[PDB]
Symmetry: C2
Subunit: 51 residues, 2 copies
């Protein structure tokens, strides 16, 4: 939806919701490190990725 709006992230900030559910499920912080870096988020959202 967003990568077709602004693929450079200039018009968007990436947020996360329910990251505690990662701890309730087997936690993979290595996937979180990619999350903060936006490797798996095509829109390349700008700003700090709040949770």
């Amino acid at each position: 939806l967003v990568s077709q709006m602004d693929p450079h992230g200039r018009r968007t900030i990436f947020v996360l919701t329910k990251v505690d559910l990662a701890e309730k499920n087997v936690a993979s912080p290595s996937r979180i490190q990619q999350i903060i870096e936006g490797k798996l988020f095509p829109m390349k959202a700008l700003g700090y990725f709040a949770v």
Copy 2:
């Protein structure tokens, strides 16, 4: 995909993972009960089981 390859509910069985999150209300309990009953499938399904 299964709604097109198995619209008749002859092969496809849906299984719900993270059943413990229905207890915590992390995932909507109402939509969990409906998927157990099968009201939320746009197709026929072979069955449903809890993971």
